[PDB]
Amino acid sequence: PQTLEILDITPCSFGGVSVITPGTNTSNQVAVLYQGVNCTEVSNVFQTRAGCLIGAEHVNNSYECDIPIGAGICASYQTSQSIIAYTMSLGAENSVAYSNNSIAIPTNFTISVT
């Protein structure tokens, strides 16, 4: 009411808080995800699209992932050994040698009892 500048109202930073852990038979240290909030609001700081992920370490490599983080990030437990937060690898980057003359069937077989 005093000056005439128009100022917005956006709600306070809320969200969930998830705990990323290995088994208690495996380890004792945990990561703490903070869902949705950028983490200038709230141990090793790491920002993702899911939100802040404190307590774990970013790794530039990419593995077949174990613990779903969200938004293309996964967590695991390895190197002593710690908790790492990496982009999930989607499998081996195979290149098929396709030609105008090529065919393939695998050599041996396993009678797989699925």
Binding site: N101, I103, A104, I105, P106, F109, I111, S112
Partner: protein, 213 residues
């Protein structure tokens, strides 16, 4: 000479089971539904208490009917919530029971030509196992594993005839028909129709004919 491949792998894979994510989830989901229902008998829902005896025998009946009316609504909403979760969860289990009936008919009571319906690979045969509140299918499938690389052409005109095949395969210099079993190229599984301008990409090579020998 590969029943010894099967039996060992059948014994190893039954061992790997010895060394149930879907079934144990179903048993646990029923347990949490029942356990939440019983813990609703310790909820007030706005009344004085939850044990029906002391609502009656602490205060006057004039307003005891009002307080028990709030309590009976909370119990009835808890019972309706439990029932409507059982109806949704029974529709999920009936979809799994119709999939298991389809797998019994098409994988056990017959062979399925459908790709990746009765296990990864060329499906050979299944065995059901009468698991607790479920069924375990031992999907015996023919999976070739260790890869290769041949060389082939869209069709093979020998002396002016386009063939329609069985797979033309070739290890690098000579052509085999084919599971990775190099058999001799024969016009038994390839039939003659057309010419070598009538199939794009065609190369020129021999096709062994069985009437000649």
């Amino acid at each position: 000479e590969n029943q010894k491949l099967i039996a060992n792998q059948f014994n190893s894979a039954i061992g790997k089971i010895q060394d149930l994510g879907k079934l144990q989830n179903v048993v646990n989901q029923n347990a949490q539904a029942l356990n939440t229902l019983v813990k609703q008998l310790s909820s007030n829902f706005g009344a004085i208490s939850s044990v029906l005896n002391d609502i009656l025998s602490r205060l006057d009946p004039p307003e005891a009917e009002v307080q028990i009316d709030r309590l009976i609504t909370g119990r009835l909403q808890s019972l309706q919530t439990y029932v409507t979760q059982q109806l949704i969860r029974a529709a999920e289990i009936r979809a799994s029971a119709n999939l298991a009936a389809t797998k019994m008919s098409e994988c056990v009571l017959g062979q399925s030509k459908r790709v990746d319906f009765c296990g990864k690979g060329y499906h050979l045969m299944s065995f059901p196992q009468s698991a607790p509140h479920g069924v375990v299918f031992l999907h015996v499938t023919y999976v070739p594993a260790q890869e290769k690389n041949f060389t082939t052409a869209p069709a093979i005109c020998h002396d002016g005839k386009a063939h329609f095949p069985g797979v033309f395969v070739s290890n690098g210099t000579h052509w085999f028909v084919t599971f990775y079993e190099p058999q001799i190229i024969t016009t038994d599984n390839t039939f003659v129709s057309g010419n070598c301008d009538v199939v794009i990409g065609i190369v020129n090579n021999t096709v062994y004919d069985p009437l000649q020998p």
